[PDB]
RNA sequence: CAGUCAAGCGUUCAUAGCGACAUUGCUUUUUGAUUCUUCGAUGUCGGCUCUUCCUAUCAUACCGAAGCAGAAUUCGGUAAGCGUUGGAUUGUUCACCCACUAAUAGGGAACGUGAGCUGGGUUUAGACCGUCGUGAGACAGGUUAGUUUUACCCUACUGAUGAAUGUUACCGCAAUAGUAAUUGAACUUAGUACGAGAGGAACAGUUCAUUCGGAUAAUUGGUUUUUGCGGCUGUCUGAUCAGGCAUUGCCGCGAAGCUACCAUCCGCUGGAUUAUGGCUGAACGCCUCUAAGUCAGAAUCCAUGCUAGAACGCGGUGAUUUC
RNA sequence: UCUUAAGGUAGCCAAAUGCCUCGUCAUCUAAUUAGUGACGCGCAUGAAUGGAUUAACGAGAUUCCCACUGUCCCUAUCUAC
RNA sequence: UGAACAGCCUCUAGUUGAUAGAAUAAUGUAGAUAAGGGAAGUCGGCAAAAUAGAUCCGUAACUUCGGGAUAAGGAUUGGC
């Protein structure tokens, strides 16, 4: 087996836990949770969301 | 006049009456078929339903598409501390059925089981089985002959056992007590086996083994007085309807001028005895051991109890069971396990099972981490972590 | 499927009932597909037959070419938009639901496919695999 | 609806299958006929819902016959166990079409069912047309609009308690009643058998699904008064901080719990039998499945199993009050 | 040719008038006893017993399409009383 | 606040009345939300939803030339 990375939060997705999405352009996204999923459908930016790994690494926290 | 468009009986009538059980501990109606060629051993067990979780393994049915591929499966977990054998009774057979002629207990008893004899224990002399111990306190004064009576008679024997509700994390202190049939060897052997095992633990490593199909017998969760619509699966009547739509519209014809039993009706849902079968065991595991949650592939030392515990149960520090799928019964509840009655091979009951990974994540939410080590690793330190 | 069931199928959560209009993905001239029936469908009272991924169906064209319009035709689903569950527990869903015209045996009357499809359909209907760009 | 008979059809041949002319019966699901009950009122079509029953069996199980090579089909038997759809138009019953289907069989229960719905239709009063009528007015002729009441009683039903058995607690038995699992596809057998060719099987085996059921809530989804976190508008609290009101103010997230063929898991094997085919076997010195005896045999029947446990069915066991 | 006081003219239709009738043709539909457009030996259309249209208006009757939706597949959950 | 003696909050004045207490089963009444599909339901889209203010843009047939027309249909809207 393997573990993966939420498009939004960038989190380990242990098997089965979480949702998957396949846009018409064949981009396969994965979501650990409906929180991330709903934000994605809202077309939010994780780099702006604070608790996200992208914001974390863009503001240079936990270096 | 006839039914214009056909459709089947809503619900199942073998499972009637849909009424509250006689107990919080489902009766075991039937045990397997006794045979003598095997050794004396139990044919049932008792534990407490703890909860569910989810695992991973490699299927093997030669002809599927997930043959030799991974899957993920919902399992159910039971906490099965070893049951204390105390006593046995003897059943002689009549044209009026099996019938107990003797119940032999043991000398010494635990507060939990004689509490189960009592109701108001906190104000009690605790006077129970004292004169039984005084029938004991000698060599065999009035016990040896009961045993030999059971030998001379009693085609069937059932061993009395009780649980360790104090080993559980529960808050009851009132042990559960029950009988199990033995389906091995001869009758003298059964009784002397039990005599050896008076006041003695018995465990799941002895009663069961992996890849065994069993029956789960328990009482299904109570849902109160309920309408016909959830209780039977009847069509919700339409929007425009005076005086209720969560109903059955016609409940019978003019003639017979009575309500037929088969018609649906509101009333008790749940707290029902149920006996589900063909539940493959996937893992026995040990309280007196760590790494219960760790397969040969993971090898990350971790028990089965997730972060923050089982919801409404706690920990699994006793011997435990992981079985495929669901079972009748809710969390914190008793459960009566049972060997099968029939040598189902089917290339489904013989599918040998070896595991890969076991979700030990928090069910009190949407848990991302199986371990706080992993948690701190992913997160870094924290304000509280000085 | 039946006829063109190159093997079997595992159940898929059902989200395309009769009355559903779903996109057409192929190069056959169509724009939409009005589902009206399902093969291998169950027969229960006041239950709508529901299609799935891989389920061959009978459909109509409410929008498209006047050679295709006003006649039924077999069609096959490749996209669902309803979260179903594979044996690895992955809950997955597209954003749209679409299909492709076919013959009863399963060969696409159209020569191509425009977008992603489902691996189940790709494994069950080989001509779709032939005309597939991307699979999942 | 089913029989008797059999001129004829069926290449030849009455009976594989049909079966005119003639004839004997059955049913009450039509429609008449009658007017026994009912006019100090039995709520009146259909649909929806929901159960149950019959079989004159559409499909499924096992079988027999064929103008049955195979496939497909037709006839017939035990069989009502199990199932018999979604839609278009119509108030519709009915009909007709579309499509799936294993198959889309017919009927009964006060033409089941209105203190269960609805009120399209019919069936008051308003109104329009046509025809009839001098006219008021008439028309199972057409159209439109038109109040659908009460259960708190008894019974039945579902669930739920419960006196009395010397008391109380625990473990059990199991009378009786109920009962459930259903059908299809795909691969393989095998492009084999069979068939001149055309075409084209089957049993076993495997994986899957349909329908129904019984549980469960790890996962996903839903729900959210956790009024838990954050935010938003208006206004009030001098401003801030923090908060009230806005019939739960609104939004996003949202655990727990409940819940979903929208999710998951499970859904037993033995005996006696029918029809049918048979074994030995006479009557009838042969022969014959039958007469005595006897074998296998089905979705049947009964048990296994499962559900409740007789509250007036029972058993085993423990402890049984003192100043 | 019989007969009438004279024999329905313009125009309109299976229309709220048309039994037969689910009239025939077309269209809308996968399918339409509906809807619309045409046809007219119209049982029984029709001219201030007003005919044929008619913009706008209608808590009028009717059909279809877009959107929308717990009407529905198929139900579930929550709140106050 | 806002186009507004709308709706919502407040000041003065007035009330705090309407049997109450405990729990929160069914069925209801009133209010709501619901994945995928989208009227397949039904006599019939009944009920409910969706749209909604303002500014800008654009605007069909038909017409009694007056209208239809907010046609349709699209964009934008905060704070400092």
Curated annotation (Swiss-Prot), chain A:
<feature type="modified residue" description="Phosphoserine">
    <location>
        <position position="7"/>
    </location>
</feature>
<protein>
    <recommendedName>
        <fullName>Large ribosomal subunit protein eL24A</fullName>
    </recommendedName>
</protein>
<comment type="function">
    <text>Component of the ribosome, a large ribonucleoprotein complex responsible for the synthesis of proteins in the cell. The small ribosomal subunit (SSU) binds messenger RNAs (mRNAs) and translates the encoded message by selecting cognate aminoacyl-transfer RNA (tRNA) molecules. The large subunit (LSU) contains the ribosomal catalytic site termed the peptidyl transferase center (PTC), which catalyzes the formation of peptide bonds, thereby polymerizing the amino acids delivered by tRNAs into a polypeptide chain.</text>
</comment>
<comment type="subunit">
    <text>Component of the large ribosomal subunit (LSU). Mature yeast ribosomes consist of a small (40S) and a large (60S) subunit. The 40S small subunit contains 1 molecule of ribosomal RNA (18S rRNA) and 33 different proteins (encoded by 57 genes). The large 60S subunit contains 3 rRNA molecules (25S, 5.8S and 5S rRNA) and 46 different proteins (encoded by 81 genes).</text>
</comment>
<comment type="similarity">
    <text>Belongs to the eukaryotic ribosomal protein eL24 family.</text>
</comment>
Curated annotation (Swiss-Prot), chain C:
<dbReference type="GO" id="GO:0005829">
    <property type="term" value="C:cytosol"/>
</dbReference>
<keyword id="KW-0689">Ribosomal protein</keyword>
<comment type="subunit">
    <text>Component of the large ribosomal subunit (LSU). Mature yeast ribosomes consist of a small (40S) and a large (60S) subunit. The 40S small subunit contains 1 molecule of ribosomal RNA (18S rRNA) and 33 different proteins (encoded by 57 genes). The large 60S subunit contains 3 rRNA molecules (25S, 5.8S and 5S rRNA) and 46 different proteins (encoded by 81 genes).</text>
</comment>
<feature type="modified residue" description="N6,N6-dimethyllysine; by RKM1">
    <location>
        <position position="109"/>
    </location>
</feature>
<dbReference type="InterPro" id="IPR036853">
    <property type="entry name" value="Ribosomal_uL14_sf"/>
</dbReference>
<dbReference type="GO" id="GO:0070180">
    <property type="term" value="F:large ribosomal subunit rRNA binding"/>
</dbReference>
<dbReference type="InterPro" id="IPR000218">
    <property type="entry name" value="Ribosomal_uL14"/>
</dbReference>
<protein>
    <recommendedName>
        <fullName>Large ribosomal subunit protein uL14A</fullName>
    </recommendedName>
</protein>
<keyword id="KW-0963">Cytoplasm</keyword>
<comment type="similarity">
    <text>Belongs to the universal ribosomal protein uL14 family.</text>
</comment>
<dbReference type="GO" id="GO:0002181">
    <property type="term" value="P:cytoplasmic translation"/>
</dbReference>
<dbReference type="Pfam" id="PF00238">
    <property type="entry name" value="Ribosomal_L14"/>
</dbReference>
<dbReference type="GO" id="GO:0022625">
    <property type="term" value="C:cytosolic large ribosomal subunit"/>
</dbReference>
<feature type="modified residue" description="N6,N6-dimethyllysine; by RKM1">
    <location>
        <position position="105"/>
    </location>
</feature>
<dbReference type="GO" id="GO:0003735">
    <property type="term" value="F:structural constituent of ribosome"/>
</dbReference>
<dbReference type="InterPro" id="IPR019972">
    <property type="entry name" value="Ribosomal_uL14_CS"/>
</dbReference>
<keyword id="KW-0687">Ribonucleoprotein</keyword>
<comment type="function">
    <text>Component of the ribosome, a large ribonucleoprotein complex responsible for the synthesis of proteins in the cell. The small ribosomal subunit (SSU) binds messenger RNAs (mRNAs) and translates the encoded message by selecting cognate aminoacyl-transfer RNA (tRNA) molecules. The large subunit (LSU) contains the ribosomal catalytic site termed the peptidyl transferase center (PTC), which catalyzes the formation of peptide bonds, thereby polymerizing the amino acids delivered by tRNAs into a polypeptide chain.</text>
</comment>
<keyword id="KW-0488">Methylation</keyword>
<feature type="modified residue" description="N-acetylserine">
    <location>
        <position position="1"/>
    </location>
</feature>
<keyword id="KW-0007">Acetylation</keyword>
